[PDB]
């Protein structure tokens, strides 16, 4: 299994994989109980009021001032039972993802995608960037800095605004300069979205009530894909967007969708990014990888005593798949760069995960959500690592009956309809 221990939220802290921690949010916070489910990966069963100090209020604004398509519940994830269920739900989704070859490949890439040690001002020394670490309270009550790649945390005020969040650098654009940074994914396994089986209905903002439910494993995978891009520092700048001209409803409102999202979804959506802008990005990131190889060559010493310079230089040789000549000098091989870049951007896509999970899912990112449902994937009678909602040897096994909220109604509680509110 990807997660070797089946944590219970109330398990006693041990200061190693169950501990109270603080994150580098450049602010003050009380320690929060966290769980290390795998090397470099932690889960914090708390609403995210930490990564962004300006988003510490879970209470919903006045009804007359609510972004109409959203969902608020200040009480969600406030009790121990909820946190226990959250932990078990997130763990289950990681196992479901890991159980597929594609998911195993993606998670392996994520674990190997250690944020680059580029926090040194002296080019002759290699140093870690503190914001790519968390402070773990040890048994003696002292704090120790631990590097990590990924954190899964609960959503902020708007429960359904799932997204990758990461700490920036004063000058370096870590998610776009090849360096990478620790990714905090706001996510919840306790809710999902309804979509429509007919394309003309799903992509219309006035039709459909959300007959089918999105498998949360796909939703998490989508975020993990963004995380992969960001950990390897190849995310596409959000200012690079597609001025949608294939959907009258999007078009009539001049709506734009980032290339990063289209790339992440994959399939036909990825084609909205023309060959010219794509060759542009590829060259840009190729050069960023070149700079990393260069920085490694100039490194003559390392800061800290946790690992050796040789060990860390090798860690990044593996991450970026660099080549080492006779002088021990690192260089970026075009074939290897293209292969890795393509893996992270074209192989790891939402559309491909749908193929591996064998689930029904939106056919394009350019659609309109229909509703949000409350769910509970923890009980095996409701959802499994192997079949999600479409349980084998039951009436829910075929035709995505498990995702059919009308047939499998006992597994979904519609909390809000979005149709007609865009």
């Amino acid at each position: 299994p990807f997660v070797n221990k089946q944590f219970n939220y109330k398990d006693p802290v041990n200061g190693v994989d169950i501990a109270y921690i603080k994150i580098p949010n450049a602010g003050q916070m009380q320690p929060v109980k966290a769980f290390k489910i795998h090397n470099k990966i932690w889960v914090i069963p708390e609403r995210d009021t930490f990564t962004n100090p300006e988003e510490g209020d879970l209470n919903p604004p006045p009804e007359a001032k609510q972004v109409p398509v959203s969902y608020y519940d200040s009480t969600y994830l406030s009790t121990d039972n909820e946190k226990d269920n959250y932990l078990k739900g997130v763990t289950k989704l990681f196992e479901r993802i890991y159980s597929t070859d594609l998911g195993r490949m993606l998670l392996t890439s994520i674990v190997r995608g250690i944020p680059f040690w580029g926090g040194s001002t002296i080019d002759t020394e290699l140093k870690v960037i503190d914001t790519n670490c968390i402070n773990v309270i040890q048994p003696d009550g002292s704090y120790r800095s631990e590097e990590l790649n990924l954190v899964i945390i609960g959503p902020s005020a708007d429960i359904i605004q799932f997204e990758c969040k990461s700490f920036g650098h004063e000058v370096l654009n870590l998610t776009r300069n090849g360096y990478g940074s620790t990714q905090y994914i706001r996510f919840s396994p306790d809710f999902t979205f309804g979509f429509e089986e007919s394309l003309e209905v799903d992509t219309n903002p006035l039709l459909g009530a959300g007959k089918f439910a999105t498998d949360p494993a796909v939703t998490l995978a989508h975020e993990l894909i963004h995380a992969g891009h960001r950990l390897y520092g190849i995310a596409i700048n959000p200012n690079r967007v597609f001025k949608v001209n294939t959907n009258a409803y999007y078009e009539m409102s001049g709506l734009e969708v980032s290339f990063e999202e289209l790339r992440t979804f994959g399939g036909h959506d990825a084609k909205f990014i023309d060959s010219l802008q794509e060759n542009e990005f590829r060259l840009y990131y190729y050069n960023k990888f070149k700079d990393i190889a260069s920085t490694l060559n100039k490194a003559k010493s390392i800061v800290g005593t946790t690992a050796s310079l040789q060990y860390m230089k090798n860690v990044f040789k593996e991450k970026y798949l660099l080549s080492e000549d006779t002088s021990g000098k690192f260089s970026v091989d075009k074939l290897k760069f293209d292969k890795l870049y393509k893996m992270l951007t074209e192989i790891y896509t939402e559309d491909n995960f749908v193929k591996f999970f064998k689930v029904l899912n939106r056919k394009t990112y350019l659609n309109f959500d229909k509703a949000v449902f409350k769910i509970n994937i923890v009980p095996k009678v409701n959802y499994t690592i192997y079949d999600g909602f479409n349980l084998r040897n039951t009436n829910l096994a075929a035709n995505f009956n498990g995702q059919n909220t009308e047939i499998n109604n006992m597994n979904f509680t519609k909390l809000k309809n979005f149709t007609g509110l865009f």
């Binding site: 398509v69 990112y365 309109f368 959500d369």
Partner: peptide, 4 residues
Amino acid sequence: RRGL
């Protein structure tokens, strides 16, 4: 991000 999920989008619209």
